[PDB]
Amino acid sequence: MYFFSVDPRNGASKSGDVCGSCCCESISARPGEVNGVMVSYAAWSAPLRGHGLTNKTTFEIDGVSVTPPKVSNAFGRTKVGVVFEGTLSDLFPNPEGEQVEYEISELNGPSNGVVELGANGAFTYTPGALFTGVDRFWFSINGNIGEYVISVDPTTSELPQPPFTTPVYVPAARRSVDPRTHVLKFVLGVSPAAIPGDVYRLTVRQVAIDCDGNEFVHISCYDISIGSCG
Amino acid sequence: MYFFSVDPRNGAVCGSCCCESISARPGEVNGVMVSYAAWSAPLRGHGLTNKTTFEIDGVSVTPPKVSNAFGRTKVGVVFEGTLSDLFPNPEGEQVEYEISELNGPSNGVVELGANGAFTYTPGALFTGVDRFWFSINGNIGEYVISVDPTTSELPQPPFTTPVYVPAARRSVDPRTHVLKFVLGVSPAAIPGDVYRLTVRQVAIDCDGNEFVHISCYDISIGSCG
Amino acid sequence: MYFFSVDPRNGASKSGDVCGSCCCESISARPGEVNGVMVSYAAWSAPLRGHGLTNKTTFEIDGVSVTPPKVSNAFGRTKVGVVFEGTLSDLFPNPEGEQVEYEISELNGPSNGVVELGANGAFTYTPGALFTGVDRFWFSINGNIGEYVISVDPTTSELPQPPFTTPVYVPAARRSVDPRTHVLKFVLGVSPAAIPGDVYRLTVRQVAIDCDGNEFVHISCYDISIGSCG
Amino acid sequence: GLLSCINMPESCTPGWTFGEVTQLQANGFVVSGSPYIYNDVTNYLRDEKNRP
Numbered sequence: 098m099y100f101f102s103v104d105p106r107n108g109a110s111k112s113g114d115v116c117g118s119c120c121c122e123s124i125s126a127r128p129g130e131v132n133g134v135m136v137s138y139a140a141w142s143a144p145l146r147g148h149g150l151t152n153k154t155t156f157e158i159d160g161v162s163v164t165p166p167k168v169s170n171a172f173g174r175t176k177v178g179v180v181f182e183g184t185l186s187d188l189f190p191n192p193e194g195e196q197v198e199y200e201i202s203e204l205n206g207p208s209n210g211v212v213e214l215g216a217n218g219a220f221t222y223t224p225g226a227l228f229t230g231v232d233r234f235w236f237s238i239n240g241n242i243g244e245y246v247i248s249v250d251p252t253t254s255e256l257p258q259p260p261f262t263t264p265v266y267v268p269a270a271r272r273s274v275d276p277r278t279h280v281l282k283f284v285l286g287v288s289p290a291a292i293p294g295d296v297y298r299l300t301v302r303q304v305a306i307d308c309d310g311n312e313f314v315h316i317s318c319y320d321i322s323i324g325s326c327g
Numbered sequence: 328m329y330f331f332s333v334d335p336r337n338g339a340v341c342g343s344c345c346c347e348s349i350s351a352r353p354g355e356v357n358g359v360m361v362s363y364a365a366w367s368a369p370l371r372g373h374g375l376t377n378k379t380t381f382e383i384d385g386v387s388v389t390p391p392k393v394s395n396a397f398g399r400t401k402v403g404v405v406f407e408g409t410l411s412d413l414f415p416n417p418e419g420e421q422v423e424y425e426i427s428e429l430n431g432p433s434n435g436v437v438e439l440g441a442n443g444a445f446t447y448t449p450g451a452l453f454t455g456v457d458r459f460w461f462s463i464n465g466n467i468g469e470y471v472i473s474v475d476p477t478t479s480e481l482p483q484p485p486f487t488t489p490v491y492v493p494a495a496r497r498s499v500d501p502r503t504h505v506l507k508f509v510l511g512v513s514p515a516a517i518p519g520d521v522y523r524l525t526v527r528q529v530a531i532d533c534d535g536n537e538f539v540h541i542s543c544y545d546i547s548i549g550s551c552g
Numbered sequence: 553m554y555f556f557s558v559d560p561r562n563g564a565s566k567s568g569d570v571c572g573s574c575c576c577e578s579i580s581a582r583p584g585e586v587n588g589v590m591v592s593y594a595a596w597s598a599p600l601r602g603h604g605l606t607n608k609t610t611f612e613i614d615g616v617s618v619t620p621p622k623v624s625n626a627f628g629r630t631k632v633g634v635v636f637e638g639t640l641s642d643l644f645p646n647p648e649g650e651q652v653e654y655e656i657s658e659l660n661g662p663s664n665g666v667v668e669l670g671a672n673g674a675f676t677y678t679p680g681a682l683f684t685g686v687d688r689f690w691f692s693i694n695g696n697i698g699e700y701v702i703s704v705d706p707t708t709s710e711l712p713q714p715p716f717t718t719p720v721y722v723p724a725a726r727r728s729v730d731p732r733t734h735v736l737k738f739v740l741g742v743s744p745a746a747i748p749g750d751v752y753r754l755t756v757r758q759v760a761i762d763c764d765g766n767e768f769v770h771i772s773c774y775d776i777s778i779g780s781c782g
Numbered sequence: 783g784l785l786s787c788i789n790m791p792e793s794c795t796p797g798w799t800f801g802e803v804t805q806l807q808a809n810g811f812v813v814s815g816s817p818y819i820y821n822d823v824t825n826y827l828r829d830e831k832n833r834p
Contacts, residue, residue: 098599099563104552106357107328109350119832120552125561125569129757131769132561133600144328145358155429161831203612204757204771271766284766296831302354302429311496311509314356316429318551322830326574326773569830 098133099124099285103317105140121298121318126265128242128291128325129204131284138303139279141315147307149276155302156267156283161320162295168236168243170261170290175222176252177229183245186218189238198239205235205289210247224249231259235289242290264291265321267299274303285321293325329359329510333542335366346523346543351490352552353467354430354514363528364504366540372532374501379508380527381492386545387521393461393468395486400447401475402454408470410443414463423464430460430514435472449474456484460514467515489516490546492524510546518550553588554579554740558772560595576753576773581720582782583697583746584660586739593758594734596770602762604731609738610757611722616775617751623691623698625716630677631705632684638700641673644693653694660690660744665702679704686714690744697745719746720776722754740776748780783819790816 101122104111126132142150168189175181185199199218206212209232210224224232229251235244248256265287272283281303299321305313331347340347351357363375393414400406410424426439434453438446449457454476460469475481490512497508506528523545530538556577559565566573581587597604623644630636640654656669664680664687679687684706690699703711720742727738736758753775760768796815798806803813810825827833 098561098596100599105328106350106355107330109329118551123568125563125566127561127771129769129771130561131767133762133768141328144330157428204610204755268766284768300429307358307496311493312356313358313509314354316352316354320831322569324569324572324574326576 098135101134101136101319103136103138103141103315105144106315107140107144119320121320124285124299124319124321125324126285126287126291126321128287128293128323129289131286134283134285136281136301136303136317137279138281138305138315142279142305142313145305145307145313147305149279150274150281150303150305151276152272152274153304154272154274154281157300158263158265158267158297158321159300160264160295160297162297164292164295166243166290166292167241168238170243171245172258172261173222173245173247174250174256175224175247176250178224178226178252181222181224181247181249183220183222183247184218185214185220185236185238185245188236188243189241191239195239200237202235202237202289207232207234209249222247229256231256233262244288244290262288264288264295265297265299265323287323291323291325293323295323297321297323329357331359331361331544333361333363333366333540335369336540342545344543346525346545349510349524349544349546350549351510351512351516351546352550353512353516353518353548356509356511358507358509361506361526361542362504363506363530363540367504367530367538370530370532370538372530374504375499375506375528375530377497377499378529379497379499379506381508382525383488383490383492384523384525385489385520386523387519389517389520391468391515391517392466393463395468396470397483398447398470398472399475399480400449400472402449402477403451404449406447406449406472408445408447410445410461410463410470413443413468414466416464420464425462427460427462427514432459433457434474447472454481456481458487469513469515487511487513489513489520490522490524490548512546512548516548518548520548522546522548553590556589556591556774558591558593558596558770560599561770562599576775579740579754579774579776580779580782581740581742581746581776582780583719583742583748583778584744586741589738589740591736591756591758591772592734593736593760593770597734597760600760600762600768602760604734604760605729605736606759606761607727607729608759609727609729609736611738612755613718613720613722613752615750615752617749619747619750621698621745621747622696623693625699625701627701627703627713627716629703629705629711630679632679632707633681636677636679636702638675638677639673640669640675640691640693640700643691643698644696646694650694655692657690657692657744662687662689677702684711686711699743699745717743719743719750720752720754720778742776742778746778748778750778752776752778783822785814785817785819788816792816 138150171188173183201212201214209228210222212234213221229249232247233244235242246259250256268284274281299319301317303315329349416422424443426437434450434457435447454474456473458469458471460467473481493509493511499506523543525543527541626643628638644652654673656667664683666678667689668676684704687702688699690697701714705711723739729736756772758770807821810823810827813821
């Protein structure tokens with residue numbers, strides 16, 4: 098659990114470290130992890146005598162480094178109960194000549210079915226019976242990590258298309274704010290497709306409220322450095 | 328929350344001329360408290376009054392690159408607009424646009440097209456004003472839309488200035504001689520700019536007369552905190 | 553019993569990322585042993601005030617130095633009560649010309665039968681009367697260790713085929729977690745055929761749970777070093 | 783740092799000139815002018831993101 102204190106901007110009197118301008122706070126993260134972060138606006142909102150904070154926050158994740166992926170992600174559709182088949186060979190455009198070690202990591206396998214990887218870039222996904230939703234699984238073609246999303250339909254018409262989850266993400270509604278202690282809690286998820294060494298930036302906009310219902314906006318920044326022990 | 332103390336006028340931080348200092352980040356809305364306790368307490372009277380006057384002047388502006396635009400659509404009806412005739416892109420440069428999710432609309436949703444096109448669907452059962460902040464190749468501007476309640480129209484609001492003080496959010500505590508007010512910074516404020524805010528507060532004696540006092544603060548729009 | 557304390561993924565760990573280190577933990581193992589490992593997720597799950605861990609742990613075994621075996625394994629079948637015969641010469645493809653000293657270690661012999669090794673690569677296995685299951689025994693052909701599996705049938709049709717247990721493995725269902733003290737226990741089994749000097753890597757993916765039933769993933773890594781004599 | 787056994791054929795014009803040298807001296811490289819070695823550095827310019 099990361100725990101950060103906010104710059105209170107009381108007098109903006111914060112002797113910069115002379116050299117060391119960076120004002121965004123560093124956050125290390127590992128591919129696959131899903132960690133929790135708590136930021137304490139108490140230093141900034143406590144002098145502002147009012148009703149504390151409010152849940153009307155906002156976030157944004159602009160990247161800094163990219164290191165574009167090698168393997169592309171893929172999407173498939175099938176009906177309920179019926180077995181699905183798929184390929185894994187046209188998802189890795191290789192510039193050079195080498196072999197293709199198709200592999201499905203057991204840590205990031207399916208969630209509501211089974212996957213039997215064939216001999217050469219083929220696979221059979223048998224979904225769990227009496228089930229209708231979405232499923233994902235992360236393949237590792239020649240070390241490069243990509244994802245495959247499958248949508249199983251309840252045999253009637255069709256299911257919509259998920260947005261192909263990003264490298265670094267913040268869940269939709271898993272955040273919260275405690276106006277009693279001025280503490281904002283949120284989740285930091287790193288998909289297994291993140292490449293080690295990259296750097297992303299997360300900017301948070303938190304609004305406090307006065308005694309009469311007006312707003313006080315505060316903006317902070319964090320540097321998510323994707324590190325990896327492999 | 329900024330907290331300043333006024334000089335009690337005895338000839339007793341001059342910086343450059345007199346005025347104090349206030350750092351500020353683009354987009355924030357902070358609060359400032361100034362304590363006239365040092366100046367109004369010896370003048371035993373009825374404390375301060377609610378007759379403050381604020382004035383903003385820019386000593387470093389860096390004239391904006393992109394420009395703003397208005398809008399006067401109706402209720403429930405979708406609105407269409409372009410974002411190409413705003414940036415004059417003097418030297419040949421990619422016109423890559425972007426709608427920051429931190430400063431998106433307030434009662435609707437935009438749909439950034441492929442080439443500076445956007446579709447604003449106002450929230451159903453809503454009539455009023457709305458804004459959003461775009462970033463055309465790093466330079467930030469605002470687009471304002473007025474959704475009208477299908478009768479005739481709606482007036483034109485003023486495009487918000489980079490640094491401002493809200494219309495009615497000031498207060499005075501005569502029991503402690505403290506003035507509270509708010510400092511709002513537009514997201515379009517360019518880092519490095521420097522503005523000057525001047526205040527003219529009036530205290531009052533036990534008979535209903537006035538005592539004037541004038542001060543400044545230099546607001547430095549700085550990036551990264 | 554091994555005991556590990558997990559990285560709290562807070563911050564100080566590895567000076568954020570500046571350092572990095574995070575070199576996977578060490579586990580010394582001996583061929584034939586079956587040890588127990590415990591990991592304390594408290595330092596990570598205590599700040600996440602919620603319902604502790606869940607029984608959704610996942611493991612993975614991959615070899616970073618394997619030294620492929622010389623002698624191959626073998627599988628045989630027989631019925632209940634009937635004696636079994638077999639040879640032990642066609643399992644040792646020798647590149648050079650040398651002598652074959654067949655041997656059956658009394659430590660890792662059969663469990664429900666008796667084996668009489670022949671004079672020239674032969675063996676007679678009498679299974680235990682009134683028994684039907686699977687049986688294994690580990691031979692040492694010229695020092696090189698291999699396993700022989702026998703399937704005794706309940707005389708009706710046939711028994712399926714076991715998966716030829718790996719050098720290093722984690723038992724199917726012998727793991728547990730105590731949500732009261734944030735401790736995960738599991739077992740680590742090393743086959744008698746594991747060659748000294750080989751190195752495997754075990755990655756553990758453990759998921760905690762918040763106060764509302766959401767998930768928090770954590771991944772850790774260890775190196776199992778197959779050494780001899782401790 | 784004078785590489786002894788190279789016996790390079792003496793000439794009157796180098797390869798990398800002053801400019802491109804000064805260029806890839808900021809960028810870490812081991813430019814060699816017999817030929818002697820100087821600026822014996824490694825290709826290290828930046829920690830995780832704070833380049834200097």
